[PDB]
Write a protein that binds this ligand. Structure first.
Ligand SMILES: *[C@@H]1O[C@H](CO[C@@H]2O[C@@H](C)[C@@H](O)[C@@H](O)[C@@H]2O)[C@@H](O[C@@H]2O[C@H](CO)[C@@H](O)[C@H](O)[C@H]2NC(C)=O)[C@H](O)[C@H]1NC(C)=O
Ligand SMILES: *O[C@@H]1O[C@H](CO)[C@H](O[C@H]2O[C@H](CO)[C@H](O)[C@H](O)[C@H]2O)[C@H](O)[C@H]1O
Ligand SMILES: *[C@@H]1O[C@H](CO)[C@@H](O)[C@H](O)[C@H]1NC(C)=O
Lengths: 274, 8, 99
């Protein structure tokens, strides 16, 4: 199916504590594969997925020099934005960016993107056309004009359709055994007492991959997507994910509820009861 | 491979 | 503005005293990014803790995982202590193996 190459960049200033913290984390679909962290003597770009061992000295050297340049750019940006917003030189501030591209099953671009944020709020973004920008406030508008005059859009789209797409396909090739695998979920159900003669039924789904999955509780065919509680899908530390969903049902009426697990690794969906 | 960002 | 973090502590496999496993502490939906995450075994800080899966949602909130390998015992207890600006008091979440 479709695949994606995403880069999460963060630069946080810490007045009176030295230079800002800079971080770049790379993802190919749901698994982390690269990372740069300014906090470390000799900070370098490091592999985060096993298959990245197939890269070679050159790859790491270039990405590192590239990351250090970006680090300095955001260092300057933080100072620039204090001017745009008329802010104190002693308060902490954050800049974030999510850049990336998604390709179809055939490897051809489906979409590319780049969205910035200042202090947790939208700043500037590349529109789906990859030709224009959309600024969230008057500060971002100054950035938009600078980028329009410099022709940043063509440069970014050249990367999105070119470098981003080609390297994504390469990563998928080299890491096929891991990125193209399917780990089927293992479901479980737990029960916990409750005050007013009611019970909590929790449905667990463990060890799956990719991340996308659907968990539901039903009462005689009808989905109870209302009084149902749940957590967002979470990584489990070995490249797999987990999730849980629960409903509060009347004591002694438990056998009337069923948990449904839909996933790529499940030819036919799982149904559980307590 | 990562992009080289341009200043804001 | 400011968002308080949701801490979640869980094992990779269902616990079984004696069998190796992986303990996780997923800290999510927080902002600003500065945060301190500590995994504890019987109140003591665990050394070989790995930080990974850092990311942010559509609303820019931060997400990060802390994990370590552990061989569960019926005696041992584990928790995750987190310090963030949204809380004057550091928050510790325990590992409920029967959840
Ligand atoms: C993943 O693909 C390999 C083929 O090698 C891949 O492609 C190379 C060009 C390079 O990028 C490697 O790092 C990749 O691993 C599959 O293994 C091969 O399978 C073919 C049969 O179709 C066989 O002729 C070869 O001998 C196998 N080994 C090699 C080294 O080519 C492997 O099975 C794929 N894994 C999954 C999970 O699909
Ligand atoms: O950001 C600016 O973008 C323009 C794109 O029109 C220029 O970059 C072009 O030239 C440089 C040469 O150093 C690179 O080859 C870019 O890929 C290319 O788009 C301008 O130099 C950039 O500063
Ligand atoms: C910026 O903030 C200062 C106070 O710190 C204020 O005097 C000024 O009016 C504000 N606006 C500009 C454009 O400086």
């Amino acid at each position: 199916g479709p695949h994606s190459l995403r880069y999460f960049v963060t630069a946080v200033s810490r007045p009176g504590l030295g230079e800002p913290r800079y971080m770049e984390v790379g993802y190919v679909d749901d698994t982390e594969f690269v990372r740069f962290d300014s906090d470390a003597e000799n900070p370098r770009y490091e592999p985060r997925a096993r298959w990245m061992e197939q890269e070679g000295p050159e790859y790491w050297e270039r990405e590192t020099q590239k990351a250090k340049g970006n680090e300095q750019s955001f260092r300057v940006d933080l100072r620039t934005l204090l001017g745009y917003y008329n802010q104190s030189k002693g308060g902490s501030h954050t800049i974030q960016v999510i850049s990336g591209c998604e390709v179809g099953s055939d490897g051809r671009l489906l979409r590319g993107y780049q969205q910035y944020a200042y202090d947790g709020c939208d700043y500037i973004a590349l529109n789906e056309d990859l030709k224009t920008w959309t600024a969230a406030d008057m500060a971002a508008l100054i950035t938009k004009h600078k980028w329009e005059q410099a022709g940043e859009a063509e440069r970014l789209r050249a990367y999105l359709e070119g470098t981003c797409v080609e390297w994504l396909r390469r990563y998928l090739k080299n890491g096929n055994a891991t990125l193209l695998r399917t780990d089927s979920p293992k479901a479980h159900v737990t029960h916990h007492s409750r005050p007013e003669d009611k019970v909590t039924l929790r449905c667990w789904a463990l060890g799956f991959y990719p991340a996308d999955i659907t968990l539901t509780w039903q009462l005689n065919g009808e989905e109870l997507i209302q009084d149902m509680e749940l957590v967002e899908t979470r990584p489990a530390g070995d490249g797999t994910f987990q999730k849980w969903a629960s409903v509060v049902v009347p004591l002694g009426k438990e056998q009337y509820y069923t948990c449904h697990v839909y996933h790529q690794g499940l030819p036919e969906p799982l149904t559980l009861r307590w | 491979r990562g992009y080289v960002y341009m200043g804001l | 503005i400011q968002k308080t973090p949701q801490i979640q502590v869980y094992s990779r496999h269902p616990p079984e005293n004696g069998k190796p496993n992986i303990l996780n502490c997923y800290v999510t939906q927080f902002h600003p990014p500065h945060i301190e995450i500590q995994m504890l075994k019987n109140g003591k800080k665990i050394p070989k803790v790995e930080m990974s899966d850092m990311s942010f949602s559509k609303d820019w909130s931060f997400y990060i995982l802390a994990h370590t390998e552990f061989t569960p015992t019926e005696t041992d207890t584990y928790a995750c202590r987190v310090k963030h600006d949204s809380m004057a008091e550091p928050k510790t979440v325990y590992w409920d193996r029967d959840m």
